[model samples]
Target: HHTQILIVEDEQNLARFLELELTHENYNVDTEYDGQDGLDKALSHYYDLIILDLMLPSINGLEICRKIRQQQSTPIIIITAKSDTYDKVAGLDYGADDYIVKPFDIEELLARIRAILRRQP
Candidate 1:
């Protein structure tokens, strides 16, 4: 089955860029501008994976990850600007399947997505 990917990014340019690229790659894609909205969509739909950003309006990415873990096993990839190893470790401990620091390469992001999806049942 074709997989769906949710992109939770507040920046319009980056979010749209991800959407465009993922769409071109033939994955079903959805996007939201804030953590709250992203959480809502994530809970309401079935996605193969989610690309989440840490700093967001309404709710933080960590909180969203916690909530998702409470109700679902949906794989999550956290995207954050914080380069601190502690922060990355915290996100992974909190249930994110993987974490990516911001200013990341799109190709690398795609590779990570593919890797995660391939590992999923």
Candidate 2:
């Protein structure tokens, strides 16, 4: 499979921006602006990657990470505003494949996606 991804973030701009960028790069993309909706999509469909946010309505990304981790091996990248090591720990502690702080470089995210996808079976 090439790659399909979900972006779960409350920030509409970034979510849509990623959608455009990823799609332009020849990857499939889906987006949800709330944690509940994101979780729903994650559980109901098979996405090669998930780019998530820590702060969201309904639930947090860490909880979503754990819940999804329980059922699938989907690669999850936590893109959030939290920058402290403690926050990064919590995000990764929940089984996120990667943790990225906001004000992120999209190029870096793309590189991470490429690296992760390259390792998948």
Candidate 3:
């Protein structure tokens, strides 16, 4: 079965790129361009994984991750431009399953997705 993933990214171009890349890999991908809409869709569905951006419009990724954790254990990856160790820890601390700094290699994200999915089920 294909993995169902929700991608929450405000950057239109980057979001489209990831959507295409993940879809090409055979995962079912849904994307949201707004933070509130992302949060709504994410909490409403049972996605196998989630890819999130740190600086979003209605709500921040950290807050979203925290809120998501409050309800479910869905795997989450923080894909953000924040490149500090503190930022990394914050993402992890907010219940992110993994953290990938932006300007990342797509293959790395794919590998991390595989690893997380493997551990999940």
Candidate 4:
């Protein structure tokens, strides 16, 4: 079965680009344009990975990460514009499995996704 990836990004362009790229790479992709909707989808679905943006409309990414961690062990990758090391650490501490800064290479992001999924049983 193809791995399902949920992308929660408020930016339409970025979200669409990722959806296309991941789909082309043969992964199942779903996207949400709002934080609240994204959080709801992440909670309801059985995704192999979640690409989340920190600056969101309804809820901050950190809060969403916390909620997801509270219920499931689904791997989460935080994709944010925040480049601060402390911010990255906070995401991980809040239950993100990985954190990628914005303006990141798509290849690297895909690689991280593969790595995280591989680590799962």
Candidate 5:
């Protein structure tokens, strides 16, 4: 079965790159460039995982993670531009299943995704 993944990133190039890479790995990928639309899609649709960027227009990743947690337990992997520990910890505190900092390798991201999904059903 194909794993459905949502990527919410305001960085156009990064979003496109992730989409392409994930698709190549045999996952169904959907992307959103803004936090609002991302949240809407996350709440309205079903995805095996979510890749969320911390900084976005209209809203932020932490808030979005909180909102999503209020409704469901879908695995969320938050992407933060900061290397700062605060940003990473905040993402987890807000209910993110995992996180990756900016300038990360795609292989690591894929591994994390696989680990989380594997832990599930």
Candidate 6:
């Protein structure tokens, strides 16, 4: 079975890009354009990992990360446009497994995803 990943990004074009790239890598991807929808899906479904945007409509990534951590052990990689925002939290007390800067290379993201998944029992 292919790994399932959820991409919660408001940027449509970038979200599509991520979906395509991850699909090419053999992952099953589900995309959500808003935080509420993303959170709904996250809580209702099973995902191997989550790619979440820090700034989103309805709710924010940090809050979503926190909520998910309360109920699940799913791994999350926070995607943020502001480097300082992520660093301001000092490695994110929000419970994200990792954080990636915007405009990041797909290869690096794939590597990070692999690394996190590898650590899972």
Stretches of candidate 6 exceeding 4 Å from the true structure: 85-91
- Displacement of residue 8 (Cα, Å) in model 6 is 0.4
Estimate the TM-score of every prediction: 0.97, 0.97, 0.97, 0.97, 0.97, 0.94
State the C-alpha lDDT per candidate: 0.93, 0.92, 0.94, 0.94, 0.92, 0.91
lDDT of model 1 at position 8:
90
Clashing pairs in 2: none
Clashing pairs in model 1, backbone N/Cα/C closer than 3 A: none
lDDT of 2 by residue, 1-121 (tens): 5578999999899888999999999999999999999999999999999999989999988999999999999999999888999999988888988998998989999999998888998
State the lDDT of candidate 5 residue by residue for 1-121, as single tens digits. Answer: 6889999999999999999999999999999999999999999999999999989999898899999999989999998877778877888888999988889999999999999999887
Candidate 3, position 27, lDDT: 95
Of 2 and 3, the candidate ahead on lDDT is 3
TM-score of model 1 vs. true structure? 0.97
Residue-level lDDT of model 3, residues 45-67, one tens digit each, is 99999999989999998888988
Task: Identify the runs in model 1 with alpha carbons over 4 angstroms from their true place.
Answer: none
Model 6 per-residue lDDT tens digits across residues 15-113: 999999999999999999999999999999999999999789999888888889899989999988778863637436778888898889999999999
Write candidate 4's Cα lDDT for 1-121 as tens digits.
Answer: 9989999999999999999999999999999989999999999989999999999999998999999999999999999999999998899999999999998999999999989988889
- Of the two candidates 4 and 6, the one with more favorable lDDT, higher being better, is 4
Query: Model 1: how far is 12 from its true place, Å?
Result: 0.9
| Count of backbone collisions within predicted model 5 | 0
Which stretches in model 5 have alpha-carbon errors above 4 Å? Answer: none
Off by over 4 Å in 3: none
